[PDB]
Write a protein that binds this DNA or RNA. Structure first.
Ligand SMILES: [Mg+2]
Ligand SMILES: [Mg+2]
Ligand SMILES: [Mg+2]
Ligand SMILES: [Mg+2]
Ligand SMILES: [Mg+2]
Ligand SMILES: [Mg+2]
Ligand SMILES: [Mg+2]
Ligand SMILES: [Mg+2]
Lengths: 70, 58, 292, 159, 169
RNA sequence: GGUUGCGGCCAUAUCUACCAGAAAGCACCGUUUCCCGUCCGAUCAACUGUAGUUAAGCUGGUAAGAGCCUGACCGAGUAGUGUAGUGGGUGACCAUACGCGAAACUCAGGUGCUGCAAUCU
RNA sequence: GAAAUCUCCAGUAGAACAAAAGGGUAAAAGCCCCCUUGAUUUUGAUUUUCAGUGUGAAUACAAACCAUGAAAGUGUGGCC
RNA sequence: AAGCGAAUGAUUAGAGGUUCCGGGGUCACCUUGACCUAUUCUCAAACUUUAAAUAUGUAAGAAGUCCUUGUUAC
């Protein structure tokens, strides 16, 4: 918060500091990500994550996300 | 010296001061631009219907 | 491989019959489109198609909902007229054209006039419009994807239909007997092939050359005791029988279409419903998640 | 300098539709046009012959002439303070029947049938159309539908 | 498994490529004429690079196509020279193969203008019955995966009659 | 109901992978004297339906399939926008009042239908 | 040999279509081959610029005469 | 307006796939670039699958509709 308040002085106009309700850089709420991770619906990637959906070929949906279906 | 180049300002007011008018349809429009083959035969068809009606009425 | 999703989304499919490789829409547009000042006059098309084992000859007009068949003639029905062999050779195509011509003229009541070339000579002729009588029935040859060759069977069906007394515009540039070096027809050669002379001269030559291939090919002629010489005679008698009754007797059609439907309904795999699809995917999961 | 060629500013108007390029289907060529038919003008960029000028895109006219591959169309064009009659030679591809005329004829048929049946009884059977009317009275019960709703909600950032 | 699912030598194309044009192409034409027994076809230049000494459309190469039995007799004649020795390479993933030779004019004696050594590219195209569906004008279609010739199927077909081996040296 | 010929709309029809297909049809498929076309009967031509094969084409089925299509008080009356005020705000911009009103997204369902003629346990 | 010819596979055009750019085009409008002169004759009608004058350009016919194709058909200069 | 895990053109970041594509590095080396795959941040007056509001064309009938049947060299 202090880092961004110090960066605000370099910009013209008005800027606000908002704490996000999302987990990190994902588009998921904190409990939503927690329940999507405790169940193996979230897979780590380079720096972001891939998600499991009920769409697509099963073989891919098991080869990828092998921890799910348990 | 420079002046205005173009404007349509006031142009619709002029156009509407005398009531933009439709082209005033008629029965029997001009047969201009109709296919000449049809037009030629239409002449003889109308000649025959004129004979038939004249004989029928007299 | 690797057909990307964006390739699939941006792919525009051809018309279905272009995908199937059956209809040439470039040729069909010019075949079908009628002079707009002939408002509802049908433009009739002599569709001549060659499969293996058969020749399909149809007179076809076009509507928005689809094509309509004025008359249909087939090479496989030529047995009732006298020809049971070579039901795809060039003379058979001629007889099928002669058949569709006589049949369509009878259906339209235009057969007393326009009897056509009654006696075949191989000359180039068109159905001439009689003096003060009805004009000859108009049909234009359609050959689909068939290539244009001097001596191709489509133009033999064309010749047969022309001689049958319907008007079909055509040149003689593609009949057998035409020469590119000397631009003229062979009326005698054209006539001889009309009466099966090419195949009859083949079995004549083949019989002396070697009998084993003369027994493999032309087995059926040997089977029913048909000589090469009689092939001219049977084609002549078949043309007369075609001119006698082109009426198209249909099949008696045993095993009515309802039980054809019943019998063929048990050889088609039924689509599985959405619930059963859920059961199948649940079972595949459950077997995989059973911890081996 | 400026540029006012025949097909200027037609970059999008004469586009084919997306995944709709190619040969024109045979229905447009098997449609029949008679004199007096009301037609809509929409140019097909595939067919470069007999095209309407871009002004006539979306205009609706009357057939006055029928030729081999084309149709003569009369359009009324506002030139200054009056309308002028324009005659267009358009191939059938750039032309379609207007469904307004077909549906009005349907109403004319239905009016005739209603008039014919009304002549048996019920004079003045209200052939004219009516604008949508204010609703009549009605009774709204709460059986299984008891009113229950909240207030405006507080402000949350959502980000 | 099915008689219609049998490998066959559909084609045997036979190519020679020259950096220049002239009497080299003409004798590259007679050497094809004598063996194949049919007129060869010469090829143009797609584009000019100014480094291989070739200019557009100057007939830099010759090639002839043979089919049926003659393709088999020519192939055996050319494979006896290699002593039935091919590699793991030289078999394409589409099921075709080919190789190269040089100066087999010691067989098929014509007047024998044995002045000039000619290399020679054999390439052979394998197919099963039904390849016509991909070449016919009407209802042209694509062969199903099971019916397609593959490299493994061609290798086994070669390791059978034609009694050869691959990947060796 | 299958199939063929000619179609209409032109993916719910396409693409990938994989399994089925009785009969008939279609097909692959046999030959090169003939008319024709080839470097090459591969294609195109012709001839026999004869020598054979459903292997492929073709058709249908499967896919928590890709694509495509349809709907949804899904997102969303959101974004945008016509009209109004001596509304707010230094401004940038924004709110309100009377109207119109998306797209993405998220689920859900679906995967050719049909015309004419001929033919088929 | 990364770039010569030859063969197969995939390939919705990512090429090409004289020339700018935009549109259009896949058994073509692109490529190759065969034949040709419709880039011809005689008038009117129309669209665009617009005063609904001219010029240019273009469109659909009509009366001939022709080219091509088996034919429907197309062609009165150049895919627009 | 919207879109960019849709085409075109821009644009941030790592993941996975081990290729005579000048990675030096053994003669199969965490210490390499590209290319392909699934993802990710951000854009377009001369981009776009979609796609408003406002504006805009036509029709809402007697010069019509229905029935019967006369002319023609088309
Ligand atoms: Mg001034
Ligand atoms: Mg054609
Ligand atoms: Mg411009
Ligand atoms: Mg063969
Ligand atoms: Mg005010
Ligand atoms: Mg040109
Ligand atoms: Mg032009
Ligand atoms: Mg915007």
């Amino acid at each position: 918060v202090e880092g961004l308040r110090r960066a605000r002085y370099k910009f013209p106009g008005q800027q606000k500091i908002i704490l996000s309700k999302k987990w990190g850089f994902t588009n998921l709420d904190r409990p939503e990500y927690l329940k999507k991770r405790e169940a193996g619906e979230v897979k780590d990637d380079g720096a972001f994550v891939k998600f499991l959906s009920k769409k697509g070929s099963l073989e891919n949906n098991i080869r990828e996300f092998p921890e799910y279906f348990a | 010296a420079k002046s205005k180049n173009h404007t349509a300002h006031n142009q619709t007011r002029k156009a509407h001061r005398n009531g933009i008018k439709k082209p005033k349809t008629y029965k029997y429009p001009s047969l201009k631009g109709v296919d000449p083959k049809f037009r030629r035969n239409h002449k003889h068809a109308l000649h025959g219907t004129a004979k038939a009606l004249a004989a029928a009425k007299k | 491989d690797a057909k990307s999703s964006a390739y699939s989304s941006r792919f525009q499919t051809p018309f279905r019959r272009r995908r199937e490789g059956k209809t040439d829409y470039y040729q069909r547009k010019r075949l079908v489109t009628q002079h707009k000042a002939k408002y509802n006059t049908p433009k009739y098309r002599l569709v001549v198609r060659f499969t293996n084992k058969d020749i399909i000859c149809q007179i076809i007009s076009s509507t928005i909902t689809g094509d309509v068949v004025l008359a249909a003639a087939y090479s496989h029905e030529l047995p009732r007229y006298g020809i049971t062999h070579g039901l795809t050779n060039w003379a058979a195509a001629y007889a099928t054209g002669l058949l569709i011509a006589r049949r369509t003229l009878q259906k339209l009541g235009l057969d007393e006039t326009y009897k056509g070339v009654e006696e075949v000579e191989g000359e180039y002729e068109l159905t001439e419009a009689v003096e003060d009588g009805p004009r000859p029935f108009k049909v234009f040859l359609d050959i689909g994807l068939q290539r244009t060759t001097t001596g191709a069977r489509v133009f033999g069906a064309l010749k047969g239909a022309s001689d049958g007394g319907l008007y079909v515009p055509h040149s003689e540039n593609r009949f057998p007997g035409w020469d590119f070096e000397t631009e003229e027809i062979d009326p005698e050669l054209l006539r001889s092939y009309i009466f099966g002379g090419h195949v009859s001269q083949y079995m004549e030559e083949l019989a002396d050359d070697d009998e084993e291939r003369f027994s493999e090919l032309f087995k059926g002629y040997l089977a029913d005791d048909i000589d090469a010489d009689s092939l001219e005679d049977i084609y002549t008698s078949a043309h007369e029988a075609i001119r006698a009754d082109p009426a198209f007797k249909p099949t008696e059609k045993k095993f009515t279409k309802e039980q054809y439907a019943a019998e063929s309904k048990k050889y088609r795999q039924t689509k599985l419903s959405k619930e059963e699809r859920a059961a199948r995917v649940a079972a595949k999961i459950a077997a995989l998640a059973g911890q081996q | 300098g400026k540029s006012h060629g025949y097909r200027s500013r037609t970059r999008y108007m004469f586009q084919r539709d997306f995944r709709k390029h190619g040969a024109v289907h045979l229905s447009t060529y098997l449609k029949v046009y008679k004199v007096g038919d009301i037609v809509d003008i929409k140019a097909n960029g595939s067919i470069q012959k007999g095209m309407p000028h871009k002004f006539y895109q979306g205009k609706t006219g009357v057939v006055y002439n029928v030729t081999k591959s084309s149709v003569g169309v009369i359009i009324n064009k506002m030139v200054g303070n009056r309308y002028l009659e324009k005659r267009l030679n358009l191939r059938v591809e750039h032309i379609k029947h207007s469904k307004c005329r077909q549906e009005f004829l349907e109403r004319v048929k239905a009016n005739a049938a209603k008039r014919a049946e009304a002549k048996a009884q019920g004079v003045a059977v209200q052939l004219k159309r009516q604008p949508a009317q204010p609703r009549e009275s009605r009774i709204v019960s709460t059986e299984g539908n008891v009113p229950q709703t909240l207030a405006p909600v507080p402000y949350e950032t959502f980000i | 498994q099915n008689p219609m699912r049998d490998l066959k030598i559909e084609k045997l194309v036979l190519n020679i490529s020259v950096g220049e044009s002239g009497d080299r192409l003409t004798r590259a034409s007679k050497v094809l004429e004598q063996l194949s027994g049919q007129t060869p076809v010469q090829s143009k230049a797609r584009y000019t690079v100014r480094t291989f000494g070739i200019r557009r459309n100057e007939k830099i190469a010759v090639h002839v196509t043979v089919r049926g039995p003659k393709a088999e007799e020519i192939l055996e004649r050319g494979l006896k020279v290699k002593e039935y020795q091919l590699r793991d390479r030289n078999f394409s993933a589409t099921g075709n193969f080919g190789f190269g030779i040089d100066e087999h004019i010691d067989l098929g004696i014509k007047y024998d203008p044995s002045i000039g050594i000619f290399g020679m590219d054999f390439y052979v195209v394998m197919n099963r019955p039904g390849a016509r569906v991909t070449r016919r004008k009407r209802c042209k279609g694509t062969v199903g995966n099971s019916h397609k010739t593959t490299k493994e199927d061609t290798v086994s077909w070669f390791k059978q009659k034609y009694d050869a081996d691959v990947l060796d040296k």
